[PDB]
Design an enzyme around this catalytic site. Sequence first.
Site, PDB file in Angstrom:
ATOM      1  N   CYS C  91       2.481  15.845   7.507  1.00  0.00           N
ATOM      2  CA  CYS C  91       3.027  14.609   6.886  1.00  0.00           C
ATOM      3  C   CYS C  91       4.957  15.197   6.681  1.00  0.00           C
ATOM      4  CB  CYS C  91       2.806  14.512   5.466  1.00  0.00           C
ATOM      5  SG  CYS C  91       1.168  14.242   5.638  1.00  0.00           S
ATOM      6  N   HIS C 358       4.682   4.913   4.403  1.00  0.00           N
ATOM      7  CA  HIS C 358       4.654   6.346   4.645  1.00  0.00           C
ATOM      8  C   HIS C 358       4.530   6.405   6.081  1.00  0.00           C
ATOM      9  CE1 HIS C 358       4.223  10.632   5.036  1.00  0.00           C
ATOM     10  NE2 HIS C 358       3.116  10.606   4.660  1.00  0.00           N
ATOM     11  N   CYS C 388       3.966  16.875   0.425  1.00  0.00           N
ATOM     12  CA  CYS C 388       2.845  17.293   0.698  1.00  0.00           C
ATOM     13  C   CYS C 388       2.319  17.205   2.170  1.00  0.00           C
ATOM     14  CB  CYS C 388       1.721  16.530  -0.169  1.00  0.00           C
ATOM     15  SG  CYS C 388       1.337  14.894  -0.102  1.00  0.00           S
ATOM     16  N   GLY C 390      -0.859  17.627   5.243  1.00  0.00           N
ATOM     17  CA  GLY C 390      -2.351  17.901   5.843  1.00  0.00           C
ATOM     18  C   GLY C 390      -2.748  19.455   5.864  1.00  0.00           C
TER      19      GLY C 390
HETATM   20  C1  LIG Z   1      -5.434   3.015   0.989  1.00  0.00           C
HETATM   21  C2  LIG Z   1      -6.081   2.499   2.145  1.00  0.00           C
HETATM   22  C3  LIG Z   1      -7.386   2.861   2.896  1.00  0.00           C
HETATM   23  C4  LIG Z   1      -5.695   0.938   2.124  1.00  0.00           C
HETATM   24  O1  LIG Z   1      -5.969   0.315   3.132  1.00  0.00           O
HETATM   25  P1  LIG Z   1      -6.212  -1.323   3.276  1.00  0.00           P
HETATM   26  O2  LIG Z   1      -7.574  -1.689   2.556  1.00  0.00           O
HETATM   27  O3  LIG Z   1      -6.064  -1.881   4.681  1.00  0.00           O
HETATM   28  O4  LIG Z   1      -5.182  -1.832   2.501  1.00  0.00           O
HETATM   29  P2  LIG Z   1      -4.655  -3.424   1.990  1.00  0.00           P
HETATM   30  O5  LIG Z   1      -3.336  -3.237   1.240  1.00  0.00           O
HETATM   31  O6  LIG Z   1      -4.584  -4.289   3.334  1.00  0.00           O
HETATM   32  O7  LIG Z   1      -5.881  -3.676   1.200  1.00  0.00           O
HETATM   33  C5  LIG Z   1      -5.809  -3.407  -0.168  1.00  0.00           C
HETATM   34  C6  LIG Z   1      -6.269  -4.681  -1.024  1.00  0.00           C
HETATM   35  O8  LIG Z   1      -5.557  -4.629  -2.403  1.00  0.00           O
HETATM   36  C7  LIG Z   1      -4.407  -5.530  -2.155  1.00  0.00           C
HETATM   37  N1  LIG Z   1      -3.587  -4.713  -2.757  1.00  0.00           N
HETATM   38  C8  LIG Z   1      -3.035  -3.664  -2.404  1.00  0.00           C
HETATM   39  N2  LIG Z   1      -1.908  -3.374  -2.754  1.00  0.00           N
HETATM   40  C9  LIG Z   1      -1.702  -4.250  -3.842  1.00  0.00           C
HETATM   41  C10 LIG Z   1      -0.723  -4.487  -4.955  1.00  0.00           C
HETATM   42  N3  LIG Z   1       0.313  -3.579  -5.054  1.00  0.00           N
HETATM   43  N4  LIG Z   1      -0.721  -5.399  -5.636  1.00  0.00           N
HETATM   44  C11 LIG Z   1      -1.994  -6.349  -5.427  1.00  0.00           C
HETATM   45  N5  LIG Z   1      -2.701  -6.053  -4.328  1.00  0.00           N
HETATM   46  C12 LIG Z   1      -2.712  -5.163  -3.634  1.00  0.00           C
HETATM   47  C13 LIG Z   1      -4.450  -6.090  -0.640  1.00  0.00           C
HETATM   48  O9  LIG Z   1      -3.796  -7.099  -0.731  1.00  0.00           O
HETATM   49  C14 LIG Z   1      -5.897  -5.916  -0.248  1.00  0.00           C
HETATM   50  O10 LIG Z   1      -6.712  -6.993  -0.877  1.00  0.00           O
HETATM   51  P3  LIG Z   1      -7.874  -7.735   0.108  1.00  0.00           P
HETATM   52  O11 LIG Z   1      -8.833  -6.522   0.597  1.00  0.00           O
HETATM   53  O12 LIG Z   1      -8.581  -8.571  -0.554  1.00  0.00           O
HETATM   54  O13 LIG Z   1      -7.074  -8.358   1.301  1.00  0.00           O
HETATM   55  C15 LIG Z   1      -4.780   2.829   3.211  1.00  0.00           C
HETATM   56  O14 LIG Z   1      -3.551   2.236   2.752  1.00  0.00           O
HETATM   57  C16 LIG Z   1      -4.667   4.292   3.487  1.00  0.00           C
HETATM   58  O15 LIG Z   1      -5.548   5.154   3.982  1.00  0.00           O
HETATM   59  N6  LIG Z   1      -3.497   5.045   2.873  1.00  0.00           N
HETATM   60  C17 LIG Z   1      -3.380   6.337   2.609  1.00  0.00           C
HETATM   61  C18 LIG Z   1      -2.563   6.936   3.849  1.00  0.00           C
HETATM   62  C19 LIG Z   1      -3.376   8.492   4.323  1.00  0.00           C
HETATM   63  O16 LIG Z   1      -4.857   8.149   4.314  1.00  0.00           O
HETATM   64  N7  LIG Z   1      -2.844   9.315   4.492  1.00  0.00           N
HETATM   65  C20 LIG Z   1      -1.270   9.464   4.548  1.00  0.00           C
HETATM   66  C21 LIG Z   1      -0.894  10.879   4.859  1.00  0.00           C
HETATM   67  S1  LIG Z   1      -0.428  12.102   3.435  1.00  0.00           S
END
Ligand SMILES: CC(C)(COP(=O)(O)OP(=O)(O)OC[C@H]1O[C@@H](n2cnc3c(N)ncnc32)[C@H](O)[C@@H]1OP(=O)(O)O)[C@@H](O)C(=O)NCCC(=O)NCCS
Lengths: 729, 403, 402
Positions: C91, C358, C388, C390
């Site tokens: 990261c 990110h 941070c 990995g």
């Molecule tokens: C957390 C994670 C799994 C979410 O993936 P995702 O499910 O495809 O994300 P989405 O935003 O498309 O879906 C989240 C859901 O909540 C909703 N949502 C997300 N943020 C929101 C917000 N701020 N307000 C309202 N709703 C929100 C989305 O619209 C979606 O609803 P739905 O499933 O009915 O469509 C993914 O973003 C992730 O893994 N991120 C972390 C990064 C990581 O793993 N490592 C980084 C290296 S340090």
Amino acid sequence: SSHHHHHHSMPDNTIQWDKDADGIVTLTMDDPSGSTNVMNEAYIESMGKAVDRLVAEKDSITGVVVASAKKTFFAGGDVKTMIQARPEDAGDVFNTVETIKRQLRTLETLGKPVVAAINGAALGGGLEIALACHHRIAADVKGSQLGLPEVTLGLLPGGGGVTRTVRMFGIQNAFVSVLAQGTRFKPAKAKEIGLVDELVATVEELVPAAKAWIKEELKANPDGAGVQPWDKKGYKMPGGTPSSPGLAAILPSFPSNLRKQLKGAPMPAPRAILAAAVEGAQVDFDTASRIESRYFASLVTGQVAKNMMQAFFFDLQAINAGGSRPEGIGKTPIKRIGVLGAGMMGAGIAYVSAKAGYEVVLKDVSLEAAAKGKGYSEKLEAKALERGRTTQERSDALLARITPTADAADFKGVDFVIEAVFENQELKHKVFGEIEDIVEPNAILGSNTSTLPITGLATGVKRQEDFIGIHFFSPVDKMPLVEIIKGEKTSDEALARVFDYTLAIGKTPIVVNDSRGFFTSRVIGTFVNEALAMLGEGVEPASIEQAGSQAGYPAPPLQLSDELNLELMHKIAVATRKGVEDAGGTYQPHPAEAVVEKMIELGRSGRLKGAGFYEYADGKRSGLWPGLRETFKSGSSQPPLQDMIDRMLFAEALETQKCLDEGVLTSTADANIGSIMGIGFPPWTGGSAQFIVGYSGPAGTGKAAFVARARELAAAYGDRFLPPESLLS
Amino acid sequence: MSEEAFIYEAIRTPRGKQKNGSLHEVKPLSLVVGLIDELRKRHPDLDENLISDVILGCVSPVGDQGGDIARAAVLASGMPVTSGGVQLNRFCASGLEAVNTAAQKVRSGWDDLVLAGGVESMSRVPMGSDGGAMGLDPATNYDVMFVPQSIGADLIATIEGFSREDVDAYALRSQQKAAEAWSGGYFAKSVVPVRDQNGLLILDHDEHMRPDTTKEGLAKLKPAFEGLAALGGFDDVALQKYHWVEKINHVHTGGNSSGIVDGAALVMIGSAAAGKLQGLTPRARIVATATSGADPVIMLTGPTPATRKVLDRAGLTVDDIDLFELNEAFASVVLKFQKDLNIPDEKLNVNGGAIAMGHPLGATGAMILGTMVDELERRNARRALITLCIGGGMGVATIIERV
Amino acid sequence: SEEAFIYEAIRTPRGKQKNGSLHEVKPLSLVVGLIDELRKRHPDLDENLISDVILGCVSPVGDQGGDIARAAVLASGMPVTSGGVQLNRFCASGLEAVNTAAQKVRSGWDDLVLAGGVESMSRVPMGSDGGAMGLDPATNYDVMFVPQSIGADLIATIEGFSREDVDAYALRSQQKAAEAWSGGYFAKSVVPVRDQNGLLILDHDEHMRPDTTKEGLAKLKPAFEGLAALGGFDDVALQKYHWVEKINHVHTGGNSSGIVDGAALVMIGSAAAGKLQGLTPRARIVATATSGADPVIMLTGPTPATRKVLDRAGLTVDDIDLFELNEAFASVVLKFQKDLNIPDEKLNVNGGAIAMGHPLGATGAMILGTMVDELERRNARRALITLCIGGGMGVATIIERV
Ligand SMILES: CC(C)(COP(=O)(O)OP(=O)(O)OC[C@H]1O[C@@H](n2cnc3c(N)ncnc32)[C@H](O)[C@@H]1OP(=O)(O)O)[C@@H](O)C(=O)NCCC(=O)NCCS
Ligand SMILES: CC(C)(COP(=O)(O)OP(=O)(O)OC[C@H]1O[C@@H](n2cnc3c(N)ncnc32)[C@H](O)[C@@H]1OP(=O)(O)O)[C@@H](O)C(=O)NCCC(=O)NCCS
Ligand SMILES: CC(C)(COP(=O)(O)OP(=O)(O)OC[C@H]1O[C@@H](n2cnc3c(N)ncnc32)[C@H](O)[C@@H]1OP(=O)(O)O)[C@@H](O)C(=O)NCCC(=O)NCCS
Ligand SMILES: CC(C)(COP(=O)(O)OP(=O)(O)OC[C@H]1O[C@@H](n2cnc3c(N)ncnc32)[C@H](O)[C@@H]1OP(=O)(O)O)[C@@H](O)C(=O)NCCC(=O)NCCS
Ligand SMILES: Nc1ncnc2c1ncn2[C@@H]1O[C@H](COP(=O)(O)OP(=O)(O)O)[C@@H](OP(=O)(O)O)[C@H]1O
């Protein structure tokens, strides 16, 4: 979001709607404003209304059939609109092709089968409409063609042709077979490669077979009806995606091989096609389609596309419509052709005359010579039977129309004479003298002459009204231009007969007024003379050949000079010097003449004598003569490569302007198509006349940028690059 | 430009061959961990918490070599979790770039003790396994005029006039000097035999070497890059830029080009205060580093401007250097470098090179650096200059002084 | 010896993963677009004096393979002597690229260096490069491999951060990112991405949800309870952290960093190099530091690395005006704030990756440029940037406005 081009705000409808009792909708394309269907604003609005109706009535629609009511199926994009697109129109161009493909994408994903009833030619946008359908049926009729020839006009298939053919055949097959060359296929070849699925005998069977296929598709495969292979979850692109190790190992060689094929010429359409195909194969279909639109807008707003649309659409259309043909002359059929001379020219003229279905009498001074002239046709038929482009019984009748002889009596009944003997006025006078009374009274007397004026050659015969210049190009079987030269005593009646004969053998005619050098030989002379001058100045011969290839010429200039024979070039320089010194003037020798005489003094006059700028062994070209660099001190002059490229192109562009001023040529269309098809002027320029109004370099674009570059060339290399007054202001 | 950077250890594995190689069964991570355990064996009281980074070069960081293999080495070998771990890729010079970056980190004062080197198991992760835009993107490939390193090497021999016997003569020279170095015990201390989980021997020598090479055997070999240049059209692409060259003379074969091998190398770099605190004896000092480049189509003329820059940066001339070490990617590259700078033959790749022993891309720079540290000590000489040609037309050079 | 100064710091907008505007844009094009922006700002810049281009990239495969930094040098028509090297420290790769560029400048053997990173996560997904720590069972079994998200939920469990606590930080990030955009804070540093025809592709951080509410965040499902019960990573983490009985899975798509595409570039050089090219220095690199912590929790590296860079510069928390920590997960930022007692109004003042995304390899250089701008806008003195990493690593950097 919309199937229409505008969200706000009167075009004529071009599609007829018909829903039958089964729920099958037939969309019949019939543009009332023309003889062919074209992706104009009328089509876009009409197809948007139809697609909207298909969605609104989806509960009562079982299948769709796309058909046409014209002779052809669909001709493609509107060239008159695309040629006017400016760089600031890139947003509007991009939005137009996105709207077109939005309509086809909805049609493609209705959840029900769509069948294309291809009744005639489906080209460009026409085939793209058919590719959006799930099944294609073509009528096996005469004159029907299918393909994506956008690259021929400096464009790319922007209505989904790239994206869909790559999805169908993979990157390599789609690019090589369909996209890169814009090949036009007959309905039998189309089914063979996979553009068409089924064939019928006549156009009346198309819609019934289309509705029958829909009825069977809905019963046999109800889950996959109306679902293209790439819209299924388990889709695998043939040959793999760019992320698969198999294709990833050979993918880096695609741009290099393409650059090898183009020899480095500045023609951007093929590279844009390859980029769009590969980039599109990395992403989903809709993302791939949008990428295709961006590369399309880049070509349309560029200059090369305007050059190639001008030459290969408008200029070719003005010529094929009798633009240089005399007015109100009736057709006079041809019974028997008599070719005087069995050299490479005369033998080639006999082949293309026999291949067109004419009886040909091939006469030379000896029967042994006329036989080996017919053997030129026999070697072409053998290569035609091996490749499988003709049958034995049809190749037998071709060679049977060629009658080799050595006696002037065998010209009895000949009503069309084509002479192709050595360049010599009294020789052609003698050769025509033996034959003008044995042939028919109204027989055409044609002369395949490079430089000698037709008016002078006409004095050697009695009827000067039927004497005319019919200039062919080596090799005659492959070169498609015939330069028709009109002498002073040449009648318009003979102009039309040769014009028709040129079209009958499948060639393109230009009409030129009599003058020493005509148009093709005079202009091509400035090309080879400019390269020989560079050799004398000390430029490396390898760079000279590289400059010719990267300029876009089919053959580098030193290699071409060997084929043209330097003793013919010296003979032309003598005839030019004599005309000036007989008028009391001082001849200014082109700096190439000293190089021509030097090679003749060294006994290297070209390929005929086995020694020129190249070495020749076993008839094959080996390489540049090692003694060349010592003779002219090669390497002592190292100008930039673009200067060498521009010196060759500008020398021909300027000479083309003189031919227009002097009245040698009557139209810029003949200048462009004549330079492209006759002497091999690079097609990306659109012709040696379009090169002036379409020049693009680091110093701008247009006629003004052309004159500036010419003045820059004149300041560094000679006054011959000074632009004539007809280009100034 | 403050703290001087010193080399304290410089070791490497033997180089296993591509076809039926002894190291094909060895994961690239194990090759690095094996070298870490050897450092612990040579310094059993070293406080590893003072090691602040592990920088490993790797040209194909995919599969077995993906996911920051340097960090994987730190965690797999049980090093302190504060020891970092970063992978870098500057093509063939990745191994020397890692050492240079470690030396620059020490000189900045913000790092004390750094492990640097590289790893490349070409038999398990073949070259090009990582893809790339310059090769697998037509718009970029078309404009950059992509041409493989092999065609550029043949193009160098064509322009400079190096015949087929000229490049084969250098190939024989490299095989002889490599065999003499192994026979004389020159590599007994720095080549660390690879062993398995039970301590059983896997490889202890550079198995790509052919000590019985003869001039007649090399003459029988066929141009290895004639079917690649013709079927790919890369000859025509190169000659469109070098338009004054009519024909490319394909003189390079599998006998006068670097071998495809597996291997790893590790170098311990630190400040003077870091070495005294851990009881380490400095073996050499990093005098200067430099990075330059040349035409990307010919690609392999990068080491000449990089060497001139590191010489002028250190205030030295060619005469002040006792040993020149240039990676033997292709024979014509070394002959071109020798001709440009008039390198005395007795000072150039004196222990042999990659033609004999192999070129494990990401590790080669660190391997030939450790070779010169040992050879300066064995000859009791003072200065050595190390450099490698790089794909894309780059060059990296380093000057070390024995301490 | 030589001081390292930042002369330019620019970035692209961040395009989202699903139906993102940048999905059709090759990673190489993102970098080249930023190089052309640098040329627009300094048309008389002698590019021959640029000695290296250092780009972070966590997944250097496919479109991002083959040393994408060297590809950017050649594709943009930069001098062939300008180098080009790719690096991966997970990261923090974008900031490590900046830090390495600064250390090369300080060593004196480099004059002017381009640094930054690129990550097109929609075209090259995370983990596409493989790796031994994940795919090799022997070392996976030994290093106790656990995805970053389980460690983030574990941090919340140990520190007592509730679901409402992490959602409250998520809301604050959205609010501050929206305020910074509407306030014009990003006007000069975010460079719109355009196509080969000049048409606009993206000009804003389309992952942002400025209309986020606490009630909407409370409706989301824990996004990482399926990864825990399918791979057994919950039990693996609790084998090392044996005193906690159960992991509270509080992190969602609303309080975790977004998966986006983007690139960033930073021009770093010495004072003499900037004076020769007529460049005005914006900030000075005061100190860098790399450290680490337990690889199972994986996300506590920022604290020792920040402690180490403060001691190295002879500073304390009180000497720092702005703290910028990548918002990989909400609990990571809340733990960092609790450990060092960071004032709330000094931490991630313009929003973070929860709102804007990110893009792994580029993130370090993006938030670095964000602090260069915000110091200049506030007329403040010092900022501390950290991320941070990995594997349990941590990188921190202190910059000073000039
Ligand atoms: C957390 C994670 C799994 C979410 O993936 P995702 O499910 O495809 O994300 P989405 O935003 O498309 O879906 C989240 C859901 O909540 C909703 N949502 C997300 N943020 C929101 C917000 N701020 N307000 C309202 N709703 C929100 C989305 O619209 C979606 O609803 P739905 O499933 O009915 O469509 C993914 O973003 C992730 O893994 N991120 C972390 C990064 C990581 O793993 N490592 C980084 C290296 S340090
Ligand atoms: C369709 C075709 C194969 C056969 O045409 P044909 O039956 O011989 O008819 P003509 O060539 O005389 O053309 C008849 C009319 O169609 C028009 N036309 C045909 N294709 C057209 C196109 N793509 N754009 C604009 N007008 C077109 C002609 O300009 C002409 O209009 P006019 O009679 O008012 O002057 C031929 O017109 C052709 O080659 N079309 C070009 C298709 C193409 O390459 N498109 C590329 C862009 S998608
Ligand atoms: C340039 C272009 C618009 C059409 O050019 P053109 O009008 O055919 O050019 P000319 O005036 O020289 O045409 C005369 C040609 O007819 C050819 N010809 C006619 N009948 C032929 C036949 N049966 N077999 C082979 N050639 C034949 C002649 O050989 C001659 O040269 P060619 O073989 O190189 O085509 C078109 O070729 C194009 O744009 N091509 C796409 C770019 C490309 O070449 N891609 C291939 C990369 S693998
Ligand atoms: C040159 C190259 C293509 C050769 O590949 P290869 O043909 O599979 O290699 P081999 O070692 O099998 O050599 C081919 C033949 O030469 C023989 N040979 C090689 N060196 C020999 C020597 N010194 N004496 C005798 N025979 C020798 C081999 O035994 C083999 O014979 P065989 O094929 O009949 O069994 C490969 O080594 C290569 O790509 N190297 C160039 C460097 C490179 O790609 N990357 C560096 C970038 S800087
Ligand atoms: N544009 C060119 N045309 C012809 N020859 C060239 C060109 N560029 C370089 N050369 C040749 O390349 C050789 C030296 O290359 P240079 O260093 O001049 O190339 P550079 O221009 O890329 O620096 C010279 O040949 P020689 O060995 O006989 O001295 C030089 O003539």
